[PDB]
């Protein structure tokens, strides 16, 4: 009930600054004046087919938790973003009989329809050596390749699978389950 007037607010006091060294040698303030421009050596990493993970011979479809279905395939978008290569695993562990897919044999316009206007999606068309772009389902692919890499993504506005520059980026993944 009693209201005692408190004083105005001010900044807490601060210690004074330390003195600034004039006796510095300058030669030791910087380093040795001779400098070499930096050079980097990136560890090349060849990409082979995972073999451990491949096209499943089984049929399944989690009818209650699939992203979108079309004809004889069910399509899931991984909720957690993953690496491009690691998604080979990420599709198998998601649901039974699910695997990394290459979209154009199914026609990707539907996939690109079910995306936002900024979100990307790793897709499963690759090239092991310097040959054709292929998927686990096989065949050849037209690809908008602009980088040397082997990985590919799609976006809302994508017309064709697009090669990516760094396959270590985290993005969701397109996984498929068969019904045949």
């Amino acid at each position, epitope marked *: 009930i009693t209201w005692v007037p408190k004083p105005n607010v001010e900044v807490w006091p601060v210690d004074p600054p330390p003195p600034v060294n004039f006796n510095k040698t300058a030669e030791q303030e910087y380093g040795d004046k001779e400098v070499k421009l930096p050079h980097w050596t990136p560890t090349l990493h060849t990409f082979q087919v995972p073999q451990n993970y491949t096209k499943a011979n*089984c049929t399944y479809c989690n*009818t209650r938790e699939y992203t979108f279905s*079309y004809k*004889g395939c069910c399509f899931y978008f991984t909720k957690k973003k993953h690496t491009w290569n690691g998604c080979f695993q990420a599709c198998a562990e998601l649901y*039974p009989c699910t695997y990394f897919y290459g979209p154009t044999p199914d026609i990707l316009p*539907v996939v690109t329809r079910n995306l936002n206007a900024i979100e990307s999606l790793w897709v499963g068309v690759y090239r092991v050596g310097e040959g054709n772009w292929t998927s686990l389902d096989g065949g050849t692919f037209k690809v908008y390749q602009i980088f040397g890499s082997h990985c590919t993504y799609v976006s809302k506005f994508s017309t064709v699978p697009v090669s990516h520059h760094e396959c270590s980026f985290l993005k969701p993944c397109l996984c498929v389950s068969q*019904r045949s």
Partner: antibody
Amino acid sequence: QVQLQESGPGLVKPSQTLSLTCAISGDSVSSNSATWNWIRQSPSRGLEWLGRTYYRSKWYYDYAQSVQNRISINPDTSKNQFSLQLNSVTPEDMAVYYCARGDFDAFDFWGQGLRVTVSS
Amino acid sequence: YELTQPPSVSAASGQTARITCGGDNIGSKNVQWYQQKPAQAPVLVIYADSKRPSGVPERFSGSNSGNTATLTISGVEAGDEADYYCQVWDRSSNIFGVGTRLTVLG
């Protein structure tokens, strides 16, 4: 030669439990690329798919809305057959029951189908 | 989800018969056509819109587009008088057709 035949009691009293079993031959109940479905046909309800079961990594069972809390479909790997149980049956359940093979979309090969009537 | 097929269709013996099945984006799904002759168990006559099971007359054919799926029987001979049902799978539901009774005139 893929074939399968139904069997079980054809008469069930009101409330009560309905039990049926379909024995298959020419294929495996543990098939990796199939599903085993129970489907009933009645003039009142048309052609309604009751349920299905399959085996991949584990045994999975899928059921329809009209009998979600009442249906159970259990297989048997030994006799290569699969059963169907429907508790709390009503006169609406009077129908001809078939079993069939399928692949999630289509239902390939059907059973002979047995008529189940309810009237106490 | 809503499979609408004509209650009855008629055709003269020899002329091509057409049975239709409508629904929202049925062209995005795999339509199956089953034939049930009177007093018989349903038998798959067409699957995957156009694919035919082994041992089905080539007169039976199927198409799927947008909101219409058509099952065309070119021969229309004997034994074709039956009830034809379309079947699709919208999410967690197998939707069967109401039923199209085929009448073989002539």
